[PDB]
Write a protein that binds this ligand. Sequence first.
Ligand SMILES: Cc1cc2c3c(c1C)C(C)(C)CC=[N+]3c1c([nH]c(=O)[nH]c1=O)N2C[C@H](O)[C@H](O)[C@H](O)COP(=O)(O)O
Ligand SMILES: Cc1cc2c3c(c1C)C(C)(C)CC=[N+]3c1c([nH]c(=O)[nH]c1=O)N2C[C@H](O)[C@H](O)[C@H](O)COP(=O)(O)O
Ligand SMILES: [K+]
Ligand SMILES: [K+]
Ligand SMILES: [K+]
Ligand SMILES: [K+]
Ligand SMILES: [Mn+2]
Ligand SMILES: [Mn+2]
Lengths: 500, 500
Amino acid sequence: QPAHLCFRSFVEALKVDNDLVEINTPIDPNLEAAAITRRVCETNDKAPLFNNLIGMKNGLFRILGAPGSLRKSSADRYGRLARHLALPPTASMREILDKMLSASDMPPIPPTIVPTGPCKENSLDDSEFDLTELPVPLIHKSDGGKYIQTYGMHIVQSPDGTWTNWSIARAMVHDKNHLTGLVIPPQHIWQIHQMWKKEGRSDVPWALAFGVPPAAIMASSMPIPDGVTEAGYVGAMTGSSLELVKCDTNDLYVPATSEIVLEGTLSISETGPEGPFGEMHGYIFPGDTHLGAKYKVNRITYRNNAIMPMSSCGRLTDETHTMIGSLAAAEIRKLCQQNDLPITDAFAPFESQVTWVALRVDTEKLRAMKTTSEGFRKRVGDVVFNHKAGYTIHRLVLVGDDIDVYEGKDVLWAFSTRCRPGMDETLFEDVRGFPLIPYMGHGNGPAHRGGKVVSDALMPTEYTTGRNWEAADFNQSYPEDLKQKVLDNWTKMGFSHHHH
Amino acid sequence: QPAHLCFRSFVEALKVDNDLVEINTPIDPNLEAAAITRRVCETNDKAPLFNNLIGMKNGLFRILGAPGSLRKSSADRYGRLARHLALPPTASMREILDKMLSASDMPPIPPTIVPTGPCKENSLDDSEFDLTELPVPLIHKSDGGKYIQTYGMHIVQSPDGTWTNWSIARAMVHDKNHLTGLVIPPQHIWQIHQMWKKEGRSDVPWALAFGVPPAAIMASSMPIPDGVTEAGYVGAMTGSSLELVKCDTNDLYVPATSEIVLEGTLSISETGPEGPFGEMHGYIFPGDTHLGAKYKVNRITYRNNAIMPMSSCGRLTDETHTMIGSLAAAEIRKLCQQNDLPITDAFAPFESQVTWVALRVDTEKLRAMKTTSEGFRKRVGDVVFNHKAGYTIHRLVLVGDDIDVYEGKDVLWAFSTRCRPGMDETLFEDVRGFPLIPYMGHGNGPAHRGGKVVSDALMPTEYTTGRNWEAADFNQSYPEDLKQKVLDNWTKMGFSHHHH
Ligand SMILES: Cc1cc2c3c(c1C)C(C)(C)CC=[N+]3c1c([nH]c(=O)[nH]c1=O)N2C[C@H](O)[C@H](O)[C@H](O)COP(=O)(O)O
Ligand SMILES: Cc1cc2c3c(c1C)C(C)(C)CC=[N+]3c1c([nH]c(=O)[nH]c1=O)N2C[C@H](O)[C@H](O)[C@H](O)COP(=O)(O)O
Ligand SMILES: [K+]
Ligand SMILES: [K+]
Ligand SMILES: [K+]
Ligand SMILES: [K+]
Ligand SMILES: [Mn+2]
Ligand SMILES: [Mn+2]
């Protein structure tokens, strides 16, 4: 099966790419696996595959860390993400995001039901498993639980059957047969949970599939629209109907090649302690436990020699940056365009801890609008910060056509030089805030409201007559024939490869 | 003579360091020399010494580019700056800034007058030179003149004789015997010019010395206090009295080993076209010429085989970043401490285009103050933004003790994660602004006023009970013995030198 359609094949692809380190000696899921993976993510090293996990039994489980993290070389920096999507490993971020957006103006391709698959190779009923006995990792030393769920896909369906959502949300082991995790507004797992709660009659049928098709875990991390079934979006994106098998204990459908599947219910009534967890912004607040949603596990099925993916998340760079930030940015780009805003490109700079999105403006179109910074900033901020796709993002930076928003150095240059603090900004206090940013949930103001800004790094003439500067750089401050002469003579004079 | 005391010896030191490329074939001062130097600065390459400059005659002149720019390796990144100061080439930025601050609580060591020096080896009276005939560089293609003066020291003295100021301010050739340049508030050359203008009786006696002692050009770029003669500050810093020779046509004194000296007058009445110039923030605005100060040159003296230093300034990284930013930051650190603010360290991140200064706070002392963010931000901003040392800086970022302000990645992390936009900031509109930032002089608001902000990236408990988080990073999220095991097994497992 292709790598984008089968996690086991993805792992093979990383090996073949010389992007995998297989560790066949014993590794402790208590901190060791995650510490290795953390160092990988901080150094852009090869992804670790832990084949000999202390506490692995009867096939549950090996661990793959850093599934969506960065490679060291610039030429294939995003190669692991490209391998989720059947793209060449040298694919640009623009190409990756365009792939992820491509299904937005395609008919869905609904999934195909098949009678069995590798995920059915083994099973454990409710007398045969204990979640506390599995090699679930402790990912950070101060975490409030062992976070089994950092890179699986939650599957829940609206009561009426018409929307089946796939998404990543964290969860930790609570006891032998329950997890606790985040189920929070405005997320689709929350929206569906609320529909079941209002109906009031039962707990939400649920499954959690680990080691799903890579193209599916990317859509799981993307804020595609309300009411849109991810499986059909992924089918359109990849041009193929995804193969799904029915759960044994409920009527949800899981990817046929899932590594590990948990079946059960998400409670409409019960909660339990959840957190703290070392999170995407780079912090943990030891002892900050709060009540989270509670899941009951009734059944586990799994592949022979099952592999659990894991995100050892925190400071730069891991899946919470590469996937959360970038995929939100993609959706924001599209949202802006659909609201007739002249946005060509969007990206969440890593340097911002993916709390900013830089929006590249087609300034020719801007000029035709005959508008001003105050007006335009307000329009952009109302569109984005009143939408779910803007949830995680606290600062939008508007930049003109000369800035490559996928290059953080250029975004920082434009922000620092073109946006006058205060005057060129509009604050948004009556929007939903992202509480996990420390300045929000651990800050001076309301955790859930406000704290957002539009920073306009467009220069005044970009609204009127056009750019009226040249950069004071090698590229723009010297004629073409001179530049080329300097480059051609560079090593001959005594001064100092793309792939590497 | 030592490298820090003699520019010719500095050039030798760069050669010996394998930090120099001598170009002995003809190079055009019309853009070519500056284009090479620009590429050096953008790549952190070796400094270029142009020994064969098209238009060089009778010894005037060779060019050294990138005198204070960065080296590629992390271990000696600031080595060129260290070589200005007799420090080891591996000196940290903290060590460099501490050296530059060291004379602030020392008695000055006044200069020593000597009867002659190398700067007298050759001379040209007012019938024998023409500034338009020298190989003065065109540094950027859109510049409004040939900027002779990018790394020389202006020497002017108060009418009463009690303060002799040394500073860098740009200047360009106006005609055969005049320059135009910037003389602007609150700069000391401006302050002294205003004293002469109020007296009204004559033009200001002036000299411009190029290729001065490196330790002197660093103090020339630093905002040491009003009324403090730089020569005595440099004497204290280096522990030696600087050797000076009298000008031939006036009673000012210039460094004995200056490469090139211009003697003349700075007009109290006349101006002429000046600019545009490709500047420190990375831009030029073609055609933006304005009236600048006008200097008359009466005499040139120079060393045999004279070398003119040149800054090809613009986008990162050159002397306008390494010296302007860092040295302002140093002075701000001291100013804060002298106003009883608990600031341990200051640096202008390069990523900010040296428009920010990050201020590291001793949070134990902060806690003892029993204050709040609003109050503290206001106090810090009033001290810094009402002082000349704060002139160039538009954003101050307050960070706690865990952040290394000399590491831009950590400053950006703390800013993005710990300072809530709006709420955790105080805007300053009634302070002097730096007009050369594009959002100021080419922006939406007053060019000379406002646009400043204090951003508080201290977390709430840093004011009260202490830091209440751990980073979600390899360093802080795992115990010592585990970290060490991972590191010790790193290459053995299959994963990937300080000097490089
Ligand atoms: C890639 C990724 C996405 C996480 C995520 C992680 C990763 C690795 C973790 C597990 C390591 C840490 C926490 N995460 C959560 C999360 N969203 C959320 O509601 N709660 C989470 O706990 N997200 C983001 C969420 O997947 C995106 O917001 C999706 O848009 C949600 O899908 P939906 O639009 O269908 O609601
Ligand atoms: C290192 C450096 C410093 C420049 C400078 C440059 C460099 C290379 C240039 C020449 C390449 C571009 C422009 N510069 C000017 C400048 N200050 C100023 O008033 N006008 C200038 O034109 N400065 C900053 C000035 O030297 C510092 O603000 C000093 O504190 C001034 O000394 P003072 O405190 O004695 O007034
Ligand atoms: K999703
Ligand atoms: K602006
Ligand atoms: K000075
Ligand atoms: K704060
Ligand atoms: Mn969804
Ligand atoms: Mn001075």
